[PDB]
Amino acid sequence: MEDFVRQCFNPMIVELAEKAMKEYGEDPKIETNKFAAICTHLEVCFMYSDGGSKHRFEIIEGRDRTMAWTVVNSICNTTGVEKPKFLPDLYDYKENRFIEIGVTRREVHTYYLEKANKIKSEETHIHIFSFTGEEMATKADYTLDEESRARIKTRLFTIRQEMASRGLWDSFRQSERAA
Ligand SMILES: [Mn+2]
Ligand SMILES: [Mn+2]
């Protein structure tokens, strides 16, 4: 799985995924399912940002924690939008809201509720994708056009297929539960 990850995702995503694990005291070599999952989440966040008009999104995810909070703080101080209790992934300048992005091997609605109860924010928008082509977003507002979301759905399905083809998919799907 380690070598699958390093050949499936681009080096920039891989490097950001390694840094992110280390800061939480995780070894990518050992926790390889976590490694794949972090890379997937990052790739989705970057695809999503790319789905809007050029300036639409401020990207929060992928940054160093301290700098991430600084940017969040600048958005909050300048738009009046409420400060989130946890780091979201993007800020949407068009809709004026933070967005938390999820990618789950479980049911979209389950993960959605877990994320929503954790954040406890009326303002923040939540948008969950699965590896089975499903999505669920706050108030059924999917932010992006259908073509942009469909590209993300396709990519996740290809990741699932590439994993199953190497016998890694069962382990990956189950691992989110075991956590
Ligand atoms: Mn995040
Ligand atoms: Mn997220």
Would you give an account of this structure?
By secondary structure, the protein is an alpha+beta fold. Helices cover 53% and strands 13% of the residues. The chain has a 5-stranded mixed β-sheet, sandwiched between helices. Helix 2 crosses helix 3. The longest helix has 19 residues. It starts with a helix and ends with a helix. The chain binds manganese (II) ion (MN) (2 copies).
Bound molecules: manganese (II) ion
Q: What spatial order of strands do you see in the largest sheet?
A: 1-2-3-4-5
How many DSSP H or I helices?
7
| CATH topology tier name | Restriction Endonuclease
**Largest β-sheet summary:** 5 strands, mixed
The CATH fourth-level homologous superfamily: Influenza RNA-dependent RNA polymerase subunit PA, endonuclease domain
User: Tell me, what is the CATH class?
Assistant: Alpha Beta
End-to-end Cα distance, whole Å, is: 18 Å
- Corresponding CATH architecture: 3-Layer(aba) Sandwich
Strand content: 5-15%
Q: What is the N-to-C order of secondary-structure elements (H for helix, E for strand)?
A: HHHEHEEHEEHH
Helix content: 40-55%
> Which outline best applies?
globular
The secondary structure category is alpha+beta
Subcellular location: Host cytoplasm; Host nucleus
Family: Belongs to the influenza viruses PA family.
Active site: 115
Motif (Nuclear localization signal 1 (NLS1)): 105-120
